């Protein structure tokens, strides 16, 4: 009765607090670390409840990945990792590891400043949890201990975003945490190959450059006449994606009005993306040579101290969080010459960070596993989508709430050796359906499956050579009753052997005839026929057909 | 000079004296007479050498000099294939098995030789290394013609990849020599296409392409339900959805034919440019790739595309429009190129013409004077427009 | 099985090895000696090479020229390759490109021969051999010089030659540099990976690159069958240096191990040569003099830029200028920027603070480091004279190191430093001999010393060693020091160049898999190892090899318990004698035979189907399923 | 008898079990229960 054995304590039917323990053969991994956006009441952390109680959590838990920097997908790390005291390997890409530090420390003091206090973590935890990591690269096979292997492939959500595949045995699961294959401006999509593997946790939460020209002809007409636009972002991705297109969008159109953002956050952003440009587009990749597009030429400061006038200007904030000096619309502005576009001109873009539906049936189709997980999205859109999933795609899927045991049937395959000797025999006699009859030494768990005469050493291919006795009452020659035998068989047996043996006798298939010497009584003749296994359907009704004997 | 070589071979080491002094008379000429002779020598060396990778040398060389302009070959072919057939190594067979190659590519006049090694290849066509196998189906390939063709797509199961791909393209090989294919081979190909090896499913659809040009009119139904639909059509479909494979190369190669293609259904067209069976919004995913190369394929198909289809030209012009805005200054030029020549024969309305117009700041003066020629083109509806 | 030898060179080794129903060409090595016997490239002309004397053999003159009694030949120089002709390279499938040094000579093989397999190379060694490829043709094509040199290299003519070509080897295969169209064509079949990545080959054949440790991107390959583990080290580093560290546990269980690229002369530790090279640039400088050091653009250049702006920090040399003069200069510092991941442990723990890992950056915004594309860009305006110059190539053969020589050579009060131990350095200062400006030759060589291969081979413990001869005979300048040498318990068979090893490691197993559905339709029945037997059908596919559902004979049984076991279900008159051939036990109910002999049991009956059927079942009642 | 004794082998290796999977109804147990 193998099993793979997954529950998701969040993010099973909700957006947030994505955690999702999964144990795969006998070891239990934990998939990601977020944390509840909404819920401050402690329901912002997992409730570890369901593997520990009063407990450490190492003795069960034997690794932990995160997906990307996500709050909601890793920002439950520190509290997790020392304040309830998880001390084993902890898995995530190289920008993630650079990327979470700096954004879970601002979230920190948001809530320190929301004063939380009461079951929150410190820096220090951030920098004592921060030394138990183990960064994996892209396309990295991470084997553990002995047997259990993680495979980080490529996501597209952020910088850094990557797929989980972790294996054990034969058996594989592959965890797409967050990803979407309708690329950006930076990033490319995500791609993973043909894993078939036997269970597949997705993500589930739901013109482009059509909008992007809209975009950018709404900025291009307000700084020609003087609007003072303004982009209150949250996402750092978002952010740094608006970046480089209003970059590339002044240097093909050869102006210099400033653009301004975060001298704080911003920042340390833009130099972490500048450092990990290999994650990025291939056309960032390939024009990198050339020149740095992250050493944009409109690096401006914040503002020119917030005084620099309502006019042609640049700039870049956030929604009600920590990002930019929005000065523009209320403290400058104030009239027509006002642009502000929060997902004077009111407007709201709609970026894709997140995956659709098509993208998700696209990376389902490519991967081609045998199941299917659905996680992070609303109820009825997971409706949606299972119900499309088992229409189109004909492949089982469960979606599952909150302590939710989802659980498969699994099928391992046991390796086992061969004698290449028989192999190549096989392969070269088959060539020009039959079957292949062999003989396996199970071992203390070590087999091997090898002809019968390789067994000889190891003793054990003690013979075990079987004759059946037929009875014929005829005296002739030896030769001529072989010759008669082996005419009269290929005119009943259709086509098994048509040829001269060479000591005047009978095989058909792999059986022996003998002309033995009689027993010791004079009136009595008997034609002995040996064989094997293999070809004993085929011997006994050989001497069946012989019962009748040859003309006497 | 030959009689060197008769003097020192012989009263050579065998290990690796011989095969460095091997591979130093490969780098002269020989003329042919002395090709003759050196032929001649080289047979009498390999019967009485046993070790493999001596004899590879012999007969990579023996290879060489049957590629020398002047002399013919089909004598020494003949004692040539006469040891092939008791040759045991598979190295030295595959090898064997590529001189023999280069001499019907040598002298594909002389039919006798022809079936000859048609008859050699097939009858060493069991064997279990792949690089024979590899070696007799480029034999088929190259040479055959008016019972070839079910022996090749025999042989589109193998279960290595490279006798997968040498199979196919032994038969695109084949349809290139001039022989009308067959419509069966349809199936095997659209097998292959689904879940392969990346170089497969790349020759497999040049395969599909081949046999859809060669048959377009024919029918051929729904393997679920029961609607009957024109072969061509299915085959552009089996096509497209190869736009969404993971092998970016395998992309470029189904946009390629996506373009040659011409008698499709305009049905069919407009599904497959539509956004918002598996069919259903290719270009589109073409254009919103990340390599450049998958993407001024896919409008350079558009381009071929509409030029054959007046009345598709229609739909695809507001997605060219997007493609002046796009990164890579190649593919807007080539959009802007693809729109010059399809723009000749319809209309633009306001919003597509100003959008056109609005790129002209652009700084590159190439686009820019392409996008003037795009303008010696175009057609306007209103006087506002000009 | 089967490994050739195409380059005999030990640092810059092809070799292509023959693997189950695979062929994998490990690295691609392009011998770049070959071009000190020419004369070099001048980016300007110079009336001393223009004005060198012809060299009288009998009579010609015009194609070799002299120098200091030192015989060059006046042409464009031509670089050796792997002997392609001794395989057909249309048969091999990938090409495994250890590190940047080996990524050369690819053009070669990709394009002039038919080859049409992938290549599987990581991404720094991608873009640094990409930098090192286009330097290295721009070096070639800026002041193309015709090729002339032809007659020279025919066989008796080539005899009569002096030492320093009498010992060129096939010469005739020598081929100029490839072009840019050649380069960037042959970059275009290369597929990117990562260090610890199980590549599968068509399924009979899986590799996976290891960090090396040697340069970033470096890296070694172990190509495995399941039962079958190849490992192959290239050049690595066990020191402390700046990339990822070396990767040994990855190495063990090895069947056998090609192993290459030690350390030119292995006498030197590299870190006494850094000082020695800082503090001869130092007295140098403050003499007044100009330091020229003839580097490869990416290869040991950043460490040494570490230590040598450590050193000037500390000893106040900060008013000389450091000028890094070459076509790429700007690309591989921003390439070695950016690949922080593929360095060691400090330095992606320094990026994980906002800080760049290499520290030339920080060279540039301090304004010490000026780096050029060329002389003439604007390196020729900025530049004042007692002043540290980075460039060109260390071949002296062409660059505009060649240049800087022919301009500093005449002084005495500058000093050219060697770090590059690949060349030989008495060769390269030979075409600019008569001259009075200081050499110094302390490479700073960083591969695995036979020391430290020595500790690695005793770690990891492979079965057999494969290694070039030069590694198996010591060397000609030592040719007593016996700690130079690779010993173990195998003798580590060697190789030259076109040589062919036949291999031991052909051992006959191959993994297959059963699922349950037909493991559940077999029995066994253990005697104390497990007694089974299972007749199924083999499908194969991928070179994967799979078990569906649709015996064998085998037992020992002695006459005794036979007899007695019989007695017990219920049977009457079974005999035990002993005749010739065998102990045979006689079963008389309805004339049943059956005689044991060793090794083999044989029993007659007759065709009596319901007495075969109760024989046969009461006897595999009795003898376990087997 | 070789998948019996196999996944016997493989079963036993196990090493713990877990609060949530012991007490779980209908594959599916409560969380946040102290309130
Ligand atoms: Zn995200
Ligand atoms: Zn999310």
Redesign the interface.
């Known amino acids: 009765m193998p099993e793979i054995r997954v529950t998701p304590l969040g993010a099973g039917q909700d957006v947030g607090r994505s955690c999702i323990l999964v144990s795969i053969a006998g070891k239990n991994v934990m998939l990601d670390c977020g944390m509840h956006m909404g819920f401050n009441d402690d329901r912002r952390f997992p409730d570890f409840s369901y593997i520990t109680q009063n407990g450490r959590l190492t003795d069960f838990l034997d690794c932990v990945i995160i997906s990307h920097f996500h709050l909601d997908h890793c920002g439950a790390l520190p509290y997790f990792s020392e304040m309830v005291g998880y001390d084993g390997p902890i898995y995530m890409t190289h920008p993630t590891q650079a990327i979470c530090p700096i954004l879970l420390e601002d979230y920190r003091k948001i809530a320190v400043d929301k004063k939380g206090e009461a079951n929150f973590f410190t820096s220090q935890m951030i920098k004592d949890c921060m030394k138990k990591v183990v960064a994996v690269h892209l396309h990295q096979t991470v084997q553990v201990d002995d047997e259990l292997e993680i495979k980080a492939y490529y996501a597209g959500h952020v910088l850094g975003a990557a797929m989980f595949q972790i294996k054990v045995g034969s058996e594989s699961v592959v965890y797409t945490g967050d990803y979407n294959m309708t690329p950006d401006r930076h990033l490319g999509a995500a791609w993973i190959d043909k894993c078939r593997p036997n269970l597949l946790i997705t993500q589930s939460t739901y013109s482009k450059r059509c909008r992007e020209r809209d975009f950018l002809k709404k900025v291009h007409e307000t700084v020609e006449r003087g609007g003072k636009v303004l982009i209150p972002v949250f996402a750092l991705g978002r952010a740094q994606e608006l970046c480089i297109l209003l970059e590339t969008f002044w240097e093909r159109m050869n102006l210099k009005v400033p653009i301004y953002f975060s001298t704080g956050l911003t920042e340390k952003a833009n130099h972490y993306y500048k450092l990990f440009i290999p994650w990025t587009n291939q056309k960032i990749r390939k024009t990198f040579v050339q020149r740095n597009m992250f050493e944009f030429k409109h690096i401006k400061a914040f503002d020119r101290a917030f005084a620099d006038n309502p006019g042609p200007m640049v700039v870049f904030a956030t929604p009600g969080h920590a990002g930019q000096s929005l000065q523009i619309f209320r403290k400058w502005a104030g009239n027509e010459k006002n642009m502000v576009i929060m997902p004077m001109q009111v407007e709201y873009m709609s970026f894709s960070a997140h995956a659709d539906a098509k993208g998700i049936m696209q990376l389902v189709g490519q991967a081609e596993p045998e199941s299917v997980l659905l996680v992070h999205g609303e109820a009825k859109k997971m409706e949606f989508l299972k119900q499309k999933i088992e229409q189109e795609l004909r492949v089982n899927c469960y979606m599952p709430a909150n302590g939710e045991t989802v659980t498969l049937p699994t099928s391992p395959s046991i390796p086992v050796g061969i004698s290449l000797g028989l192999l190549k025999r096989e392969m070269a006699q088959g060539l020009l359906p039959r079957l292949l009859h062999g003989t396996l030494i199970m071992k203390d768990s070590n087999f091997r499956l090898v002809s019968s005469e390789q067994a000889l050493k190891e003793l054990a291919e003690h013979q075990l050579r079987f004759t059946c006795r037929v009875h014929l009452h005829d005296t002739r020659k030896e030769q001529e009753t072989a010759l008669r035998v082996y005419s009269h068989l290929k005119s009943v047996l259709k086509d098994h052997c048509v040829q001269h043996l060479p000591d005047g006798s009978v095989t058909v298939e792999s059986v022996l005839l003998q002309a033995a010497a009689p027993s010791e009584d004079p009136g009595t003749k008997v034609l002995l026929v040996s064989w094997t296994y293999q070809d004993e359907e085929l011997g006994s009704f050989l001497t069946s057909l012989l019962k009748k004997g040859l003309p006497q | 000079k030959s009689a060197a070589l008769h003097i020192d071979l012989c009263k050579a080491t065998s290990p ?1 004296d011989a ?2 002094y091997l ?1 130093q008379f ?2 002269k000429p020989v003329e042919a007479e002395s090709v003759e002779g050196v032929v001649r020598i080289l047979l009498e060396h390999y019967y009485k050498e046993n070790d493999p ?1 001596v004899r ?2 012999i007969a ?1 060389l023996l290879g060489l000099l049957s590629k020398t302009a002047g002399f013919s070959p089909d004598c020494i072919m003949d004692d040539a294939i006469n040891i092939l057939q008791n040759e045991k190594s598979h ?1 030295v067979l ?2 064997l098995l ?1 001189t023999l190659l280069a001499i019907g590519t040598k002298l594909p006049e002389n039919q006798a030789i022809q079936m000859r090694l048609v008859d050699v290849a097939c009858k060493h066509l ?1 064997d ?4 024979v196998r590899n070696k007799c189906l480029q034999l088929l390939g190259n040479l055959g013609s008016l019972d070839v063709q079910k022996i090749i797509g025999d042989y589109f199961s193998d ?4 006798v997968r791909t040498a199979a196919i393209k032994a038969m695109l090989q084949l349809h290139e020599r001039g022989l009308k294919l067959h419509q069966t081979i349809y199936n095997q190909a659209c097998k292959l296409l689904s ?1 392969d ?1 990346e170089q497969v499913r790349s020759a497999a659809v040049q395969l599909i392409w081949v046999v859809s040009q060669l048959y377009p009119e024919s029918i051929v139904p729904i393997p679920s339900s029961n609607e009957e639909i024109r072969l061509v059509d299915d085959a552009f479909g089996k096509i497209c959805h190869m736009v ?1 494979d ?1 092998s970016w190369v395998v992309r470029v190669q189904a946009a390629k034919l996506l373009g040659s293609m011409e008698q499709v259904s305009s049905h069919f067209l407009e599904q497959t440019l539509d ?1 918002k069976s598996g069919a259903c ?1 290719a270009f589109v995913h073409g254009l ?1 790739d ?3 190369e998958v993407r001024i394929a896919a409008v350079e198909a558009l381009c071929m595309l509409a030029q054959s289809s007046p009345s598709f030209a229609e739909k695809c012009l507001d997605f060219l429009v ?1 493609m002046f ?1 796009d ?2 200054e190649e593919v807007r030029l080539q959009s802007i190129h693809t729109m010059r020549k399809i723009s000749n024969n319809i209309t633009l309305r306001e919003d597509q013409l100003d ?1 056109v117009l ?1 790129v002209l ?4 003066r190439d686009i820019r004077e392409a996008l003037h020629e795009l303008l010696c083109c175009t057609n306007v509806s209103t006087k506002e427009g000009i | 099985m089967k490994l050739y030898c195409l380059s005999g060179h030990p640092t810059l080794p092809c070799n292509v090895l023959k693997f189950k129903s695979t062929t994998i060409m490990l690295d691609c090595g392009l011998d770049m000696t070959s071009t000190l016997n020419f004369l070099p490239l001048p980016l300007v002309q110079s009336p001393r090479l223009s004005n060198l004397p012809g060299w009288s053999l009998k009579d010609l003159d015009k194609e070799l020229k002299e120098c200091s009694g030192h015989v060059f030949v006046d042409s464009v120089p031509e670089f050796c390759l792997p002997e392609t002709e001794l395989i057909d390279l249309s048969t091999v499938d990938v090409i495994l490109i250890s590190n940047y040094h080996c990524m050369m000579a690819l053009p070669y093989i990709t394009e002039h021969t038919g080859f049409t397999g992938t290549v599987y190379a990581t991404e720094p060694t991608v873009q640094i051999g990409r930098l090192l490829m286009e330097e290295l043709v721009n070096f070639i094509e800026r002041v193309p010089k015709a090729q002339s040199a032809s007659l020279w290299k025919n066989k008796d003519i080539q005899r009569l030659l002096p030492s320093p070509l009498k010992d060129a080897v096939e010469v005739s295969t020598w081929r100029r540099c490839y072009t840019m169209q050649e380069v960037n064509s042959a970059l275009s079949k290369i597929q990117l990976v990562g260090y610890s990545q199980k590549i599968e080959l068509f399924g009979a054949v899986q590799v996976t690159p290891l960090s090396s440790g040697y340069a970033l991107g470096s890296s070694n390959w172990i190509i495995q069958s399941h039962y079958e583990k190849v490992s192959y080290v290239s050049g690595s580093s066990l020191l402390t240096t700046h990339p990822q560290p070396m990767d040994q546990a990855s190495l063990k269980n090895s069947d056998v191990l090609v192993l290459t690229g030690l350390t030119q002369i292995p006498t030197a530790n590299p870190d006494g040569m850094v000082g020695e090279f800082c503090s001869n640039l130092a007295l140098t400088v403050r003499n007044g003099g100009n330091v020229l050091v003839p580097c490869y653009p990416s290869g040991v250049i950043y460490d040494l830029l570490e230590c040598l702006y450590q050193y000037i920090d500390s000893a106040g040399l900060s008013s000389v200028p450091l000028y890094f003069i070459s076509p790429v200069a700007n690309s591989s510092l921003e390439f070695s920027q950016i690949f922080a991941e593929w360095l060691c442990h400090n330095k992606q723990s320094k990026v994980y603070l906002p800080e760049p890992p290499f520290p030339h950056a920080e060279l540039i915004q301090t304004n010490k480091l000026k780096h050029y594309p060329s002389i003439h860009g604007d390196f020729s305006n900025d530049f004042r004279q007692p002043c540290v110059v980075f460039t060109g190539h260390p071949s002296l053969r062409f660059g505009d190191v060649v240049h800087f020589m022919e301009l500093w050579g005449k002084s005495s009060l500058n000093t050219v430093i060697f770090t590059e131990p690949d060349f030989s350095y008495l060769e390269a200062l030979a075409p600019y001999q008569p001259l009075a400006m200081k050499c110094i030759y302390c490479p700073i060589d960083t591969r695995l010393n036979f020391i430290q291969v020595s500790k690695l081979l005793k770690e990891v413990q492979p079965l057999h060693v494969v290694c070039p001869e030069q590694y198996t005979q010591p060397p000609p300048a030592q040719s007593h020091r016996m700690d130079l040498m690779i010993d173990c318990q195998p003798p580590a068979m060697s190789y030259r160049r076109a040589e062919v090893l036949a291999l031991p490691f052909k051992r006959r197993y191959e993994k297959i898999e059963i699922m349950p559905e037909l493991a559940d339709s077999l029995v066994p029945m253990e005697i104390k190892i497990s007694l089974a037997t299972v007749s199924a059908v083999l499908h194969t596919k991928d070179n994967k090899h799979l078990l569906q559902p649709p015996p064998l004979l085998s037992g020992s049984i002695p006459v005794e318990q036979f007899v007695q076991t019989l007695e017990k279900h219920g049977f009457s008159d079974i005999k035990v004698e002993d005749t010739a051939k065998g102990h045979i036990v006689l079963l008389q109910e309805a004339e049943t035979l059956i005689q044991i002999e060793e090794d083999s049991t044989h029993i007659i009956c007759d065709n009596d189907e319901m007495l075969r059927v109760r024989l046969r079942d009461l006897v595999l009642k009795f003898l376990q399923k087997f | 008898s070789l998948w019996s004794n196999r996944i016997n082998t493989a079963n036993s290796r196990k090493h713990q079990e877990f609060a949530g999977r012991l007490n779980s109804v209908n594959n599916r147990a409560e969380l946040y229960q102290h309130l």
């Open positions: 690796a095969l460095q591979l490969a780098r990778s590879l040398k990579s190295q595959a090898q590529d069991t279990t290394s792949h690089g279960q290595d990849p490279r879940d090896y969404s993971g956004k919004g919103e990340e390599m450049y997007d805005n990164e890579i959008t609005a700041e652009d700084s590159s």
